[PDB]
Structure formats: C-alpha cells, structure tokens
Unconditional design. Sequence first.
Lengths: 131, 146, 137
Amino acid sequence: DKPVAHVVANPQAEGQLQWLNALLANGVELRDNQLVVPSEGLYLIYSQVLFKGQGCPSTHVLLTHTISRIAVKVNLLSAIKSPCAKPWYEPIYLGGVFQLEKGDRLSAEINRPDYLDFAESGQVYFGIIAL
Amino acid sequence: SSSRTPSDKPVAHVVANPQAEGQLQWLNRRANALLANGVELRDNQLVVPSEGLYLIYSQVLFKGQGCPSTHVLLTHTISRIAVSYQTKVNLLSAIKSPCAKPWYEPIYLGGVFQLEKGDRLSAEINRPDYLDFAESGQVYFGIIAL
Amino acid sequence: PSDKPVAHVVANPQAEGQLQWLNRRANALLANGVELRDNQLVVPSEGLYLIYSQVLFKGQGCPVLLTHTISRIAVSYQTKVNLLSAIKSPCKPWYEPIYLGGVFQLEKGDRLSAEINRPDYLDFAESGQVYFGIIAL
Ligand SMILES: CC(C)(O)c1ncc(-c2ccc3nc4n(c3c2)[C@@H](c2ccccc2)CCC4)cn1
C-alpha cells in the first residue's frame, strides 16, 4: 500500500519528454507532466533518459537531465553530458532518497528532447517509491 | 543528529560542500539532504547502524574547458570498511578519460550490497579540481536499507 | 529481512580474457531466490525488475568496436532476446565505461546474461568497475 509510480516517455511526442502512465498506485498522480506526492515521507526517486545523435552539429551539444521538486522549484538530482557522421548514444540516469511533503510535484526534465531516443521510450522512465 | 521515520529503515543522502578546498566533503546539514534511522556521517563516511541489504549510490560531475596537453583521468569510487575485518574494499568504481569547448563527465554509481553493523562507507574522487557545482543536485552519496 | 529477489555479481578480476560473473566475492550478492548458473542470473519469480550492468573497457592508444548486451532467455523461448545493448567506438590510455539499465517484466526461471564482445579490452585493475545486478521492484 506504499505510494509508488513508474512512468515512461511517450515515443510519439514531438519536441518533448512527455510522461505516461508503467504504473501509478496508492495515491500518486501524474498531472501536468509531474508526479504528485500523496503523503509526507521518505521516497526513493529515480529516472533514466536516453539520447542519440548522428554526428555532431555546428552548435555545441550539452545534454541535461534534472529531477526537481516543487513544494505547495528546486533541483534534487541533475547531470550534464557533452557527447561531442558516426552515431552516438548517451544515457543519463539519476536516483536518490528524499524527504517529500504532501502535494509536492516532481518533474524529470531534459533540455534537448530533439535528441531523445524515442524508439527506446520504454526505458526512458521516471519513478518514485515510498520507503 | 537522531532523526526517525515510521519505516525505521536506515537511510542517508548527503551532498558535497561546493566551497571545500581541494576535497570532496559530504554534508548532511543541508536542505534536501538527510540522515535517518541510525545512519551517521563521521569523518566524511556514512556509518551503517544495522546489518542488511542496502542500495548504495553516488554521483559526481566533472567539467573542464577544452583538453590540456597532460592526460586527464577521472575516478569515482565507493568503498566499504568493515569493523570485524578492518579492511578497505571497493564496492563500485569508474574511470573516465574525457580527452576550447566545455566537456562534462558525470559518474553515477549504484548497486545493492549486504552490509554489516558499523560498516563505514566512503565516496571519493581523484580530481576535486575538476568537480562542477554550477547547479544543485550534481554531487551526492546515499544509502537505502531494503 | 527484505523478501525481494536481488543480485549484484562482479567480474572475476583474475579471469583476464573472459567476463566470468561471481557471486561469492566480497561485496557480491545473491538473495531471496536469485541464482547464478552457467554465468547467468536466474530469476526466481515473475515481476518487474530493474536490470543493470556496468562494464569498463581500457586501451593504450589506438590500433575497435566495443559492445555490451543484456539478454533474456525465457523458459518458453530458450534463445537470447536482447533487452539492452550498447556499442562504442573509442578510436594515451582511453577508458570507456558502458552502463546499461532498464526496468522489465520478467518471468519465473528467466536467465539473464550480460556479455561483451571484447573481454581482451576489459579493465580488471580496480575492484567495483564491472558488475551486473537485478532488483525486484
Ligand atoms: C526500494 C525498491 C522498491 O526495492 C526499489 N529499488 C530500486 C528501484 C529502482 C528502479 C529503477 C531505477 N533506475 C535507476 N535507479 C533505479 C532504482 C537508481 C539506482 C539503481 C541501482 C542502485 C541504486 C539506485 C538510479 C539509477 C537509475 C526501485 N525500487
């Protein structure tokens, strides 16, 4: 009966990382692309995004992935990669334990959805589990 | 500190001090950082209060501006020191060779381990001069009892 | 004690030229039914699992395609189905860590393999660099 969620990216979304319900249980909601915490407590929060490109363009490519908390906006977990015509592939994966409050909204965002590996949307995920 | 939560599961999430000169110094006295249900932070190490299975994780982020003439090797290692054994042991480790455009190299390490009461866990790097602290949430170390 | 099937196995640092997973090593584990048989993790019960693996390749200069693949062999289709795969072209010492991870629905008796194409390029200098594990969600 512990609040839990595991949401996955929509492969059909254009220019965005749209989360889809995968599961939501025991009060967790997915609203406006954010996971909504039903009760105060410790939660493991995790995510993985996958990027891919064909070669390197004229502008420097920096890929970011950040999990933030908005209490009723602060970065909890974040990382950046610089991958740069040969194909390249890079994952960014994050996780940690945090004390959350009722009604907190969690977001898992990237700066370059144009580089998402949409074909592997099943493994572009974001989830929480109450501990 | 002695914080408690209803599940009584030992947990910790500590973060780097960005102004620590030439080192990776962990802190629990920060917003969105914590020690609960018996975990202690002593001499820069997490101290396990009870035996059991634990998830152990850490992330560091390195950044440089271009590539220098000397070879850059970046390492991040999580180690365990047991009381009965008194021997250091690497649990998780990675090495990266990133090489003027900025480069970024995160290192995330995570796994599941059987730990013993009184074990001390360390999370260390070889190049604190390449650590990046431009945003919160980039450098951290934690444990979660299952 | 936790009842969730879990495993974290590590490469045998002295088995140079091979990728042999070990569960008896210090800081390697099998719990709650997971087995290590014929170099594969055996799933004890159906459910959602995180599967992960890190390998680390190293070379001294450039003479190379490096692959890392996690596959599933089901009792109902006893052939490798690739679940996660990566390929790198690394070409002074170079290092190439490869991480694979994902959440999958597994069945009782599934065998999971984590394999590379070039064990001659694996780095076995330090402990904790090469591992393969599962965690029942
Ligand atoms: C507590 C419970 C219910 O047993 C449970 N354990 C683990 C997960 C889980 C699932 C998917 C994940 N993807 C990642 N992680 C995931 C954790 C993080 C990570 C991996 C391995 C070690 C430590 C951290 C961070 C990297 C990406 C979910 N639920």
